[PDB]
Amino acid sequence: AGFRKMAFPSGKVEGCMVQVTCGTTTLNGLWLDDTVYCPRHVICTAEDMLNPNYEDLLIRKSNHSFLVQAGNVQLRVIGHSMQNCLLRLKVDTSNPKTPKYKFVRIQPGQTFSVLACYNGSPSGVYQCAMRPNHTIKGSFLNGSCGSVGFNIDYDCVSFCYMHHMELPTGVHAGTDLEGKFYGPFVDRQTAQAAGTDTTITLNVLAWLYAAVINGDRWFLNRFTTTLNDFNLVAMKYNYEPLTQDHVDILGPLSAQTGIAVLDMCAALKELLQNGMNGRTILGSTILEDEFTPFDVVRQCS
Amino acid sequence: AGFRKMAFPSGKVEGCMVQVTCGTTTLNGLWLDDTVYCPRHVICTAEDMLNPNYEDLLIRKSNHSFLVQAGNVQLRVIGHSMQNCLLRLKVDTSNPKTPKYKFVRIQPGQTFSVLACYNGSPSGVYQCAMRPNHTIKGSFLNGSCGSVGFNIDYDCVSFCYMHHMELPTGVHAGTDLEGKFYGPFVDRQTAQAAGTDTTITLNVLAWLYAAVINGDRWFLNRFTTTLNDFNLVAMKYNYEPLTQDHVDILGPLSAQTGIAVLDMCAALKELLQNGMNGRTILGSTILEDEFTPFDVVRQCS
Ligand SMILES: CCOC(=O)CC[C@H](C[C@@H]1CCNC1=O)NC(=O)[C@H](CC=C(C)C)CC(=O)[C@@H](NC(=O)[C@H](CO)NC(=O)OC(C)(C)C)C(C)C
Ligand SMILES: CCOC(=O)CC[C@H](C[C@@H]1CCNC1=O)NC(=O)[C@H](CC=C(C)C)CC(=O)[C@@H](NC(=O)[C@H](CO)NC(=O)OC(C)(C)C)C(C)C
């Protein structure tokens, strides 16, 4: 009956974390086989932060401009290139700890685990969601850049995020492992701000299914709703519109619990309009939107 | 400005997880050097669950009564004993992945990370606190017994918890690595229930210090309080009484923020009496009690 935000076990990723230094700038990098990936802004310095030309800044560097440390062991850079907002450093050794892996670009609403690292040393792990506004409500201090986000399924590590910056509101922005930014953000210290965010409707619904599979039915009601009537309440409470694709995704959870999706949507509409009055769902006093339908299945095994 | 419940990176512990089978009962064990630790109730069967004599049940077993798997690799049991509610299985190989480690018995209020495991395979990690009532609000499905809780400080793993049971309310009970139970619980399927729980005052206060170190001061006030006057509001709202030791522990955070402890206690008393009215502290709509003063320092590095 207990229900937590669970992170994937971080071992396979810990073994890939390294420190990358260029001048007086140190940050984290990801060491897979004989390549080290890291934010290209390692190459920036004090002044050229508001307006960096990365092409110009990189042509002035050599393979020994980059110092790369796995543990206290040093690795030799034997070649380098820039791919979008990432550096790709070729090194003399293949990481003997390289897991089976892939690079994936996740979509908003999807969740992943972040291994927060400082100077190439893993310090903490937590579960995150890609917000509709392409930021993450993470926890990153000075020296956290190059920390990665990932999912794991049977020993295959899907990398999906690398950390680059904190925005003024305190939220975090970064790239896939290609690394193209998620969202309209750039790796220069300018006036960029997160757009307005929305609650992830599909996840709230998934999580209400989890509450029922877990035994609790108090919020359910005798009513139903149409998609369009739901989306009017959604629009007022700043929830993403529900689509037919979302309704289909909720199929398996709907069948398992015997509660129709639009009936669950009626239940949610009632929770939105009437509040929760002193009560909790799966331990929470708020409607949780950072568990996907896939997360619900796995944790309600 | 973002603030998450962070778990320790789980790698060092993943490498120690194994599967232990005895009859038709499989669960997890912890493999350190040439010893495998696991809940003694691996040796129980269908009927003898409500009333097991573990001494009687164990004398009837031999070293080959126990099947132990690290990965798919098998390990040979070459001796065995029972220590309190744990089995200690001696095996032919020392775990080549044994981290530097210790066994610690934690106190209520303290926090730790749990690596939830199924059949010797790590599946998720999350941060937990030992509740005042000696249970944990964890997340454990069938097959999770033998999962461990731990802290890590510079590559030393302090093991503090091993999972044994779920209580009727959905909360979890287990032992230290000696393994004496935390709380008045026993490893037999009887009528045991968690006692009434309390909010961990020291942690709420620590977390209010974190909110200020993180920039937010809205809940602060011009008032102060005495320890005794605070403990009267505490008693009504089911918070642990504050002691002088707790006031001393909050010393460093008090000095760093320039807010006196009893002034913070005045702020908390005001939050308890007036609610939070639509506002949030470090992202939360509730007063968080699962971050210790030590947790606050580390995550506000
Ligand atoms: C040790 C040196 O190497 C690193 O690891 C850097 C890690 C931190 C990530 C930070 C640390 C705190 N939270 C984070 O996520 N990233 C950065 O500082 C980024 C590096 C970007 C470059 C060099 C072009 C820049 C930022 O995150 C900075 N953020 C901004 O400039 C944001 C977005 O552009 N803008 C912003 O805050 O608005 C102003 C400029 C009007 C005040 C903050 C530190 C103020
Ligand atoms: C695969 C077989 O091996 C395992 O891994 C066992 C792991 C689970 C842990 C469970 C699973 C769900 N949540 C958990 O934490 N532990 C157990 O089932 C425990 C094994 C104890 C023995 C054999 C003496 C027993 C329990 O946790 C059981 N709990 C109780 O009996 C609790 C506390 O005594 N009592 C209780 O619920 O009240 C009743 C008896 C009046 C209904 C539940 C499964 C019902």
UniProtKB/Swiss-Prot annotation, chains A, B:
Superkingdom, natural source: Viruses
Domain (Peptidase C30): residue spans on this chain: 2-301
Localization annotation: Host cytoplasm; Host Golgi apparatus
Signal peptide, first to last residue: none
Active site annotation, chain numbering: H41 (for 3cl-pro activity), C145 (for 3cl-pro activity)
Catalytic activity: TSAVLQ-|-SGFRK-NH2 and SGVTFQ-|-GKFKK the two peptides corresponding to the two self-cleavage sites of the SARS 3C-like proteinase are the two most reactive peptide substrates. The enzyme exhibits a strong preference for substrates containing Gln at P1 position and Leu at P2 position
Segments on the Cytoplasmic side according to the record's topology features: 2-301
Known role: Cleaves the C-terminus of replicase polyprotein at 11 sites. Recognizes substrates containing the core sequence [ILMVF]-Q-|-[SGACN]. May cleave human NLRP1 in lung epithelial cells, thereby activating the NLRP1 inflammasome pathway. Also able to bind an ADP-ribose-1''-phosphate (ADRP). May cleave host ATP6V1G1 thereby modifying host vacuoles intracellular pH.
Subunit structure comment from the entry: Monomer. Homodimer. Only the homodimer shows catalytic activity.
Protein name (record): 3C-like proteinase nsp5
Primary gene name: rep
